[PDB]
Design a protein around this ligand. Structure first.
Ligand SMILES: *[C@@H]1O[C@H](CO)[C@@H](O[C@@H]2O[C@H](CO)[C@@H](O)[C@H](O)[C@H]2NC(C)=O)[C@H](O)[C@H]1NC(C)=O
Ligand SMILES: *[C@@H]1O[C@H](CO)[C@@H](O[C@@H]2O[C@H](CO)[C@@H](O)[C@H](O)[C@H]2NC(C)=O)[C@H](O)[C@H]1NC(C)=O
Ligand SMILES: *[C@@H]1O[C@H](CO)[C@@H](O)[C@H](O)[C@H]1NC(C)=O
Ligand SMILES: *[C@@H]1O[C@H](CO)[C@@H](O)[C@H](O)[C@H]1NC(C)=O
Lengths: 154, 136, 39, 867
């Protein structure tokens, strides 16, 4: 029915991996919906993110591969995360068999323009969470072609 | 269980001994291969049940591919391939008499336009119509 | 070509430009008010 | 085409390493019948070494030649592990009869004779023996040899006696022999003897004289014998009585002969005591005598001129193991008496180094003066065929480089080039006088020069035999050859052009990266790509196994492109890794990302490049191997350009392509091989941030898949199991009507997922190789070089494969000139870039931009190589 997936974040001055639990993902396989329940950032995390933003570091997310059999991870410029008012979207890519494939995090809007951001802005997690199952590619269209050529012949 | 597809291949006007030296019969896109014997006929062995396109590949003279449907029980039939509207059946005798259709046309002839081709130029007409408008 | 720059020209339009730019030369060398032109 | 055959193009036909060869032919027939490791059966002209008729087979082991025999004028072959036996007419160049055989591992093949003529074939499998007619191949009789469930049969003998000898052994135990009759096939007789020291019969034992079995025993340094005609117990003769000994840690061999199957074998035979050591022994009624001892001789061979047997012995002029200079002499020795022939010695030299002859097949004939005149086909260690003729002039007749049959990687290298104003004017006027004098004066690797159009390049080819070639791209000749000692067949290569020829003060320099699969250790070989010699710059010793390599566009001071390697410990090794190089790539470290695709675990990882030459886990994805295995990781070529960033959509508007230069196109297959549940996935994973742009999965489809990735679009051909038809599927990536980030493109600054346009077409034939046509500036339209199994090269226009072709034409389509969508793709014979120059068993198509803008150089490599 529903499976809970951990989700850790990491951001440091040295840009190393210090993933810490951020939010839980409730993937309900039946209806194909995912909901996250994250805790808001603290002052030190906000502060840590500030130096990471100052030094143009990266913000890395990581989730377990299975509901500790592995992990799938990605990263996003934390300074772009902070210059977007903590507005981002993370897409969960799975496969046809319903197995976790990857996680992609991207801010909104992307990039950076040197916009200074106050601390008060970073007390909300504007996060759009989507799940991306593999999209079946369309096969070649034959019915239209045969009917069309039949009309041409007649 | 394992069946063989027989057939023949003759090029009109050319003896087999002249073209079979560098010709191969392909069963379903090189997935199975066979070689034509001296007389011109061919036999392919080790064919499981299904549908296979048989083509006599020869650089000298092309050959029309033919679909062959062989069943697990053993009965098997030949027909004309059609990747579009594959449900159709156009029966062709099983001892494939794939007569060639002459040498292929890999080359394209030179244009060699004549003065009669230059006579009716679309550009000349489309640029002389304004000339007539300017005069009138 | 499809993506070729428009500044590249074939033979016909080059000849047209040549025939456009030579009337002044004709008047220069042949003589004033020569009859070789395009009107 | 245009009927200008041979004006610019050239094809070379190459067979693989010669697994089995046959030289015995009529003197006027001038034919060689050879079956190679590439499943190819071919006929070579004796005089010049050219193909008469060549018959390739399935690339896999399901058509592998297992045994060749020649009789009269038709050659008889066995393929697919004894499954099929065929008779090929050597004259016409076609089959005579093809017969499938029963199950059971083939172990030995032989012929039988009734009284004087061979008419049937005895083929033995591990559990049975079968007889087939020569005239038609009809099965004569099949007998299951007794007790065969335990014994392993290794040889078959017959002769004019009209009987069949079968021999089987059990390792380190007794062996058994069965007598059958050719007329019926019933077990005439059966005997067993004890051979505690014996290991196997075919490799060690042999049979000479009148079916007399001879096993060399190294345990006691002797020659165990069994007069198989009458004797029922093995006899023993030490070699000390004959002043002979065996080597240490070696298996001695015995080489008999049989001029014709009907007659008994010659009493004399060879014995391979130790490597670089042979003996000639003549067995005569329970005892043997040494005829001639050949020490420090590499290879020996036997031949029959019709009445007498001739032995050819190979050794270099003077031993220095190895050999001083690669000068090998082959001498003729009579077999009746171990006497060297007179004025028959041949001497040749191998061009390469570290290569020694491996195979020697000699063909003999009677000269005008009744002297045995012989020719020798010798295959070296590096898969090279040499035809040596007795007469001194042109001691080699035709040297064939069969090694080039299996090329792993090749590249095209451009040929070498052919304050005060008063000073500037002075030198300019001086140059003017120089040019005037040069004009008025007008009243081969040595002189190699670049063409005006840069249309004549040089191809640096790598061969899995570890051989490097330099082939002129215009004529197809070879300019330089080099050999890499100790290269495993399965080793992985990687060739990189570090410095081109545009830096005259600096030598051209290329780097090849080989990686042994078994060991995992990778090595770097740096060589001049023009001359082929190793550069004096010693490449670094890659201690750790490596995973991936990058050719950074940054160049050293000597205009050598920096190359980066990621080892097993995920460290990065630079090359040349100088202080300037180290500084440049350390200062530009955070903008370098690696991606490693572990196909075994279905994992993709993307690592950064730290300042201090270290990698960190930037992103990681896992495609579960349990449902999907990665089969292709085709990324876009780095050396391409895009002319039109956007495209005109009509309406006086523009649609922007999604030019992502870091876009992977990982294609995976479904581990479910069922014809109804199979699928093929394609993920457009980003190369930097790891984002999956698209995750398409085509259902009810099966590989193999041939995908080309270009500037924007990808095109992957596949098989459709539901309808049994090869299908294309073009994916075009388009951005919005207005570009997001123009000035520059960053994979970290693409929050807008590009839209995907898809379209599936039907291809009415199979495929073997695909590659888009590449131009210098990308102005010229794009074409796919479809590689058909037939050998042709279809030039499919990319404009035809547009996914925007509407199913119903409209005014917008007519304005844009879009053809209505047609699921069928034509294979018109007029589109082939080659006429009849078919490239059998095509492996790849290389497209080079060349100079100009309309001409792209094409090299189709496979069995044949065509340009
Ligand atoms: C998170 O941030 C994004 C980006 O600012 C918000 O998306 C915007 O939504 C408004 C409508 O509310 C649109 O007009 C903008 O064009 C959107 N911007 C984009 C897509 O870049 C989003 O609403 C915010 N909140 C949530 C919960 O996702
Ligand atoms: C078959 O291949 C050959 C070699 O590439 C082609 O070469 C010559 O083509 C001219 C065309 O006029 C013929 O007159 C010659 O006889 C050919 N020489 C040969 C066959 O040795 C040849 O055109 C090709 N044939 C086809 C049908 O493509
Ligand atoms: C052998 O001697 C010949 C003649 O001097 C020379 O060309 C050749 O390079 C030498 N070495 C080898 C390995 O062939
Ligand atoms: C692209 O993004 C960068 C930030 O990554 C921004 O500075 C720039 O203005 C954007 N647009 C262009 C056209 O470069």
């Amino acid at each position: 029915g529903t499976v809970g997936l951990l989700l850790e974040h990491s951001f440091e001055i040295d840009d190393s991996a210090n993933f810490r639990k951020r939010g839980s993902l409730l993937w309900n396989q039946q209806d194909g919906t995912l909901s996250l329940s994250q805790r808001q950032l603290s002052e030190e995390e906000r502060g840590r993110l500030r130096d990471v933003a100052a030094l143009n570091g990266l913000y890395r997310v990581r989730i377990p591969r299975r509901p500790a059999g592995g992990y799938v991870s990605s990263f996003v410029p934390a300074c772009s995360l902070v210059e977007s008012h903590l507005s981002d979207q993370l897409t969960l890519h799975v496969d046809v068999a319903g197995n976790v494939v990857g996680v992609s995090v991207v801010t909104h809007p992307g990039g950076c323009r040197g916009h200074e951001v106050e601390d008060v802005d970073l007390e909300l997690f504007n996060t759009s969470v989507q799940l991306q199952p593999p999209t079946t590619a369309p096969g070649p269209e034959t019915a239209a072609f045969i009917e069309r050529l039949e009309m041409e012949q007649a | 269980d394992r069946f063989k597809i027989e057939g023949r291949a003759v090029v009109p006007g050319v003896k087999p001994q002249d073209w079979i030296s560098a010709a191969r019969v392909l069963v379903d896109g090189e997935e199975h291969v066979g070689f034509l014997k001296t007389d011109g006929s061919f036999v392919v062995h080790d064919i499981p049940s299904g549908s296979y396109v048989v083509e006599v590949v020869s650089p000298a003279y092309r050959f029309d591919p033919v679909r062959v449907d062989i069943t697990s029980k053993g009965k098997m039939r030949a027909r004309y391939v059609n990747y579009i509207k594959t449900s159709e059946v156009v029966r062709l005798p099983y001892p494939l008499q794939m007569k060639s259709s002459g040498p292929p046309s890999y080359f394209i002839k030179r244009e060699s336009w004549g003065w009669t081709d230059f006579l009716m130029n679309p550009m000349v007409m489309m640029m002389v119509l304004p000339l007539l408008i300017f005069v009138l | 070509l499809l993506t070729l720059d428009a500044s590249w020209v074939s033979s016909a339009s080059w000849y047209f430009l040549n025939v456009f730019g030579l009337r002044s030369i004709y008047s220069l060398i042949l003589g004033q008010d020569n009859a070789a032109d395009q009107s | 085409y245009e009927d200008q055959v041979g004006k610019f193009d050239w094809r070379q036909q190459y067979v693989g390493k010669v697994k089995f060869a046959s030289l015995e032919f009529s003197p006027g027939s001038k034919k060689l019948v050879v079956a190679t490791e590439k499943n190819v059966i071919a006929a070579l002209n004796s005089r010049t070494g050219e193909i008469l008729w060549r018959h390739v087979d399935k690339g896999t082991a399901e058509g592998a030649v297992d045994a060749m025999l020649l009789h009269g004028q038709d050659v008889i072959t066995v393929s697919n592990g004894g499954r099929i036996m065929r008779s090929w007419e050597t004259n016409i160049g076609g089959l005579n009869w093809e017969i499938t055989l029963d199950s059971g591992s083939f172990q030995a093949l032989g012929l039988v004779g009734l009284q004087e003529s061979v008419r049937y074939i005895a083929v033995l499998k591990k559990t049975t023996l079968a007889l087939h007619h020569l005239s038609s191949g009809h099965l004569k009789w099949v007998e299951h040899l007794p007790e065969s469930d335990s014994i392993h049969y290794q040889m078959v003998y017959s002769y004019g006696s009209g009987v069949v000898w079968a021999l089987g052994v059990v390792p380190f135990s007794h062996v058994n022999i069965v007598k059958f009759n050719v007329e019926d096939g019933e077990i005439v007789q059966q005997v067993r003897v004890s051979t505690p020291w014996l290991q196997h019969l075919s490799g060690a034992c042999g049979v000479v004289d009148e079916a007399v079995l001879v096993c060399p025993d190294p345990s006691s340094r002797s020659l165990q014998t069994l007069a198989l005609e009458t004797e029922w117990e093995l006899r023993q003769i030490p070699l000390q009585s004959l002043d002979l000994e065996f080597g240490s840690g070696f298996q001695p061999r015995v080489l008999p002969t049989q001029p014709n199957p009907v007659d008994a074998s010659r009493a004399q035979f060879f014995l391979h005591l130790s490597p670089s050591h042979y003996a000639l022994l003549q067995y005569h009624y329970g005892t043997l005598s040494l005829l001639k001892n050949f020490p420090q001789t590499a290879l020996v061979s036997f031949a029959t001129t019709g009445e007498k047997t001739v032995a050819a012995v190979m050794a270099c002029r003077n031993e220095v193991l190895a050999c001083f200079n690669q000068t090998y002499t082959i001498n003729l020795y009579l077999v009746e008496t171990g006497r060297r022939l007179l004025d028959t010695t041949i001497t040749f030299s191998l061009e390469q180094s570290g290569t020694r002859p491996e195979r020697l097949y000699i063909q003999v004939f009677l000269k005008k003066d009744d002297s045995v005149g012989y020719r020798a086909l010798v295959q070296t260690e590096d898969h090279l065929l040499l035809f040596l003729q007795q007469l001194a002039g042109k001691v080699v007749l035709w040297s064939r480089e069969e090694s080039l049959a299996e090329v792993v990687c090749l590249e095209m290298v451009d040929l070498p080039l052919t304050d005060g104003l008063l000073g500037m004017f002075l030198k300019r006027l001086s140059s003017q006088l120089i040019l005037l004098q040069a004009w008025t004066s007008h009243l081969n690797i040595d002189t190699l020069a670049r063409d005006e159009f840069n249309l004549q390049k040089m191809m640096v080819m790598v061969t899995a035999s570890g051989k490097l070639f330099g082939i002129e791209s215009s004529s197809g000749t070879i300019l330089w050859k080099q050999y890499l000692p100790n290269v495993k067949p399965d080793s992985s290569f990687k060739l990189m052009v570090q410095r081109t020829t545009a830096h005259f003060p600096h030598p051209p320099q290329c780097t090849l990266l080989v990686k042994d699969k078994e060991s995992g250790m990778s090595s770097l070989y740096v060589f001049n790509p023009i001359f082929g010699k190793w550069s004096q710059v010693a490449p670094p010793v890659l201690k750790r196994p490596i995973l991936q390599s990058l050719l950074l566009p940054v160049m050293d001071q000597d205009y050598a492109k920096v190359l980066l390697l990621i080892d097993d410990e995920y460290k990065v090794t630079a090359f040349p890794a100088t202080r300037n190089v180290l500084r440049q790539l350390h200062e530009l470290a955070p903008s370098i990302f690696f991606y490693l695709v572990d196909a075994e675990q279905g994992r993709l990882c993307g690592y950064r490049l730290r300042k201090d030459l270290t990698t960190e886990l930037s992103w990681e994805l896992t495609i579960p191997p349990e449902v999907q295995r990665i089969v292709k990781v085709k990324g876009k070529r780095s050396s391409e350009h895009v002319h039109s960033q956007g495209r005109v959509m009509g309406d006086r508007s523009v649609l922007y392509k999604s030019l992502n230069p870091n876009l992977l196109a990982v294609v995976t297959e479904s581990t479910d091989a069922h014809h109804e549940r199979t699928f093929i996935g394609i993920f457009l994973i980003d190369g930097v941030t790891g984002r999956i742009i698209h995750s398409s999965v085509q259902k009810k489809a099966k590989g193999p898949v041939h995908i080309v990735h270009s500037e924007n679009w990808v095109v992957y051909q596949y098989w459709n199991t539901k309808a049994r038809r090869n299908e294309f599927t073009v994916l075009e990536l388009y951005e919005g009507t207005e570009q997001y980030n123009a000035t520059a493109f960053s994979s970290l600054d693409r929050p807008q997922l590009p839209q995907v346009l898809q379209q599936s077409y039907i291809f009415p034939s199979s495929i073997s190789a695909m590659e888009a046509t590449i131009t210098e500036r990308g102005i010229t339209s794009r074409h796919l070089l479809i590689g058909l199994p037939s050998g042709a090269i279809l030039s499919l226009p990319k404009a035809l494969l547009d996914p925007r072709r509407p199913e119903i034409p409209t005014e917008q389509s007519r304005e844009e000139n879009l053809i209505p969508y047609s699921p069928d793709v034509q294979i018109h014979a007029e589109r082939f870039i080659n006429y009849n120059q078919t490239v059998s068993r095509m492996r790849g198509i290389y497209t080079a931009p060349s100079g100009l803008e309309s001409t792209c150089l094409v090299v189709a490599y496979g069995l044949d190589i065509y340009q």
